[PDB]
């Protein structure tokens, strides 16, 4: 987007305040940045529960959904893992798109800030056979614009 | 063990989807656009003729009061009938925010277009004002 247009702001500008202000968002950040210090980057709706159990499964499916809707988050429907009772068919990304619009807010580096904390997270035995399904998306986070 | 943020967190987000407004972030640039970085109310009801005197002072007062604009009385000029006697600039803290939200470094390009501003005599008597006062974005930007 240009900064001005005939000397005015240009056409999608409040559009994008709209979409920065929709991203600053506790939630939200709770799921992007949960996703993002995941080692993996990825998340099912099943891991977001466990990481936020002061929010509903409704709750968290009505940000997550805005957020695919925005193209700020990528919905990956996987396979059926062989080895699990009903494990996650659909995984959660954070994309290219939304990588740049938290950078844009300041709040992308944010993510790393708690890695450690999900790593060393108490987790069930149900949450440790979802992270070590093999059905897991492999995402390329590099082509994404993601700091190594 | 699964994460807590302070309750600074959410005040925090607060304060940048405040900031990323339309008409705010038109009075701010503007204001770091002018070469010697102050605005009257008047400069920017010039500015800004679309917007009813009444809104365009709430949207300054909310700035003021949230420690982003600074409010600045001066003496009454001589030179000029009815002059403004407060200026307003951008704190260091209102420049740390618009960084935040990269929305500080548009502000070179906003200098250029404002450069080109038509201006009646009467913008032009209060841009020569001796009473304007001096803010110096480096310094305030700097710390
Ligand atoms: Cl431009
Ligand atoms: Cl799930
Ligand atoms: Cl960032
Ligand atoms: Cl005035
Ligand atoms: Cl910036």
Redesign the interface.
Known sequence: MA??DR?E?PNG??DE?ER??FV???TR??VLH?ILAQPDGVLSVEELL????DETEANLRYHVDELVDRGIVEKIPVPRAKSVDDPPTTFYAVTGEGIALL????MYEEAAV?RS??E???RTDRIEAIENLETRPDVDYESRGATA
């Open positions: 900064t001005q000397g702001r500008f409040g305040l920065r202000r600053l968002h506790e950040l709770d949960q466990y990481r936020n159990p950078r844009a807010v300041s708690w904390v999900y060393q997270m108490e």
